[model samples]
Target: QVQLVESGGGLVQAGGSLRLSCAASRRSSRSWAMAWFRQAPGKEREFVAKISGDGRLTTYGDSVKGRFTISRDKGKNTVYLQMDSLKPEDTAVYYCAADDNYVTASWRSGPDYWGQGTQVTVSS
Candidate 1:
């Protein structure tokens, strides 16, 4: 039974950046890859990328490379997702999820577990 807990402040100033953490519990031999997702104010969830435990990275779809980054510290059992150049449109909930299978297809890329999402608000 593995779980990820996310924590970060809710407020972020425009033109600034926000960093959220995901700490996993319950050790497993399974590949330690976590993906980051974002749900805008009134939109569907979008895939960001897959980050390896050692911080090797892979990203697909859209311009995700511009605003997001993922990193991990295995010894601390924690991973981080950082978003830069925050704007009002950046306000949303960010999540760190473990992939049962690291595939592009939804069926294979199921997020069996998730963190208690951290909400970020970009304001003055």
Candidate 2:
């Protein structure tokens, strides 16, 4: 069985950068995937970035195209994110998440086995 988890935090500054990470425990997929989603305090979840499993292909949403980065460590089965130059609106609950894929092929977002969220506030 596989699961996603994060060490939560808060009180980050607006002008500084923030780096967060998540671990994929007991992972099973050989072509595993990793993605990051952030939901504003009162808003719905939004796509931030993702990297495909086998191909390691990556994509960034329009909102964070130039400000955020997604990374992975093959040895640790974990993913990392770099939110550089934070902004007031960047404050939100982030889910380091993914899902089990159907045997059909690859997919964009499945949103499954989501775990403890990290809340980053820019009020510092």
Candidate 3:
């Protein structure tokens, strides 16, 4: 099984920037596509970004729409999310997620396992 851990978070001032990381265990697989998610306080979880493994496709959420940059370091088994021009509304616990690669079907989406989450608070 693969495990993910969130790192690099803190109280960030508005208009500042932050970069969060999702590091995976040594058992990471190249066939696994990496993803990022966000959950604002008292709100539902939101899809942020996804980097496909085999096809090398990257997609962003409608709301995010290039506001946040997401990418993967396949060589290091890690994913990264970078935020700029932070705002109080951006405060949330962000997550790094991945899907089950050994699916029976050709198509697969969403995360099978998630990082516990990294809390990011945007302050004035």
Q: CA lDDT of each candidate?
A: 0.71, 0.72, 0.75
Candidates 2 and 3 compared: the better one by TM-score is: 3
Q: What is the Cα-based TM-score of model 3?
A: 0.83
Task: For residues 1-124, write the lDDT of model 1, one tens digit per residue.
Answer: 7678888748967988777888777766667567777788568887766665446655644654777677777677777777787778767787778865656312224777877777788896
How many Å off is the CA of 16 in candidate 2? 0.6
Per-residue error (Å), model 2, residue 108: 9.7
Evaluated against the true structure, the overall lDDT of model 2 is 0.72
Residue-level lDDT tens digits of model 3 in 1-124? 6678999888989999999998977665447777777788678877777777653677777766667887777667677888888888878888888775523112224467788999999998
lDDT of 1: 0.71
By the TM-score metric, which is better: model 1 or model 2?
Answer: 2
RMSD of 1: 2.6
Q: Give the TM-score comparing model 1 with the true structure, all chains together.
A: 0.81
**Candidate 1 has which clashing residue pairs, if any?**
none
From the highest lDDT down, the ranking of the candidates is: 3, 2, 1
Q: What would the per-residue lDDT of candidate 2 be over residues 29-115, giving only the tens digit for each residue?
A: 466566777887567777777776653677887878889888888777888888888888888888777644422112324756676
Candidate with best lDDT: 3
Candidate number that wins on lDDT, 2 or 3: 3
